Amino acid sequence: QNTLLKEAQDEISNSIAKIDNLVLLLAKKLKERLIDEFKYLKNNAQKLNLSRILNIVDITTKDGINDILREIKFENIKKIEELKTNLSLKYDFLKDDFDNGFEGFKDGISKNIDSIFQSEKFALLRLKIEKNLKSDLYELETNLDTVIFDTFKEFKMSEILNSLNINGAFFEFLNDKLKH
């Protein structure tokens, strides 16, 4: 029991010791919109392409969700390694996995909400830009509007990542309490 308490203290000490992707996704969405505009310029003035443009936002949201899921998987692997490190309590180690999964689901839901607001804002900006559009000037106006949208997406990524880090810290504290 004394050895287990020492191991728990060491784990607590280790825990005490130890946004750009969203911007890249927004830039990719802007590039896709520019490619669609160029295709519409090769043809003439397609509204179906404008309707399809909104799907690039969903693609970018899916990419962000994939990044978040990869981070969650890495956190789970780290938790498994920590459980393997020293054999003090196996049931307590198993218990916190559900809490970690719930925290990851909450982070994913927050990402969905904030990124959906950002995607709706980007769609509104694109609709405003569409409202015959001399092409190069339209591309520059899109480069400004989607720039504001990319800044909003980066802010959403930063805030949601801070919230996810806080949730992970809370889960680690709960695991430490269970070990105690």
Q: What would the DSSP string read from start to end of 86-103?
A: S-S-HHHHHHHHHHHHHH
Q: Measure Cα distances from 103 to 62, 78, 106, 109, 111 in Å.
A: 19, 15, 5, 10, 12
- Check residue 28 and report its DSSP letter: H
- Check residue 70 and report its DSSP letter: H
Q: What is the resolution of this structure in A?
A: 3.7
Quote the CA–CA distance of 17 and 178 in Å, as a whole number.
20
Task: Please tell me the experimental approach by which this structure was elucidated.
Answer: X-ray
List all residues 6 or more positions away from 54 whose beta carbon is below 8 Å from its beta carbon: 119, 123, 126
Quote the CA–CA distance of 69 and 85 in Å, as a whole number.
24
Here the tokens at position 95 are 């218990």
Quote the CA–CA distance of 108 and 69 in Å, as a whole number.
8
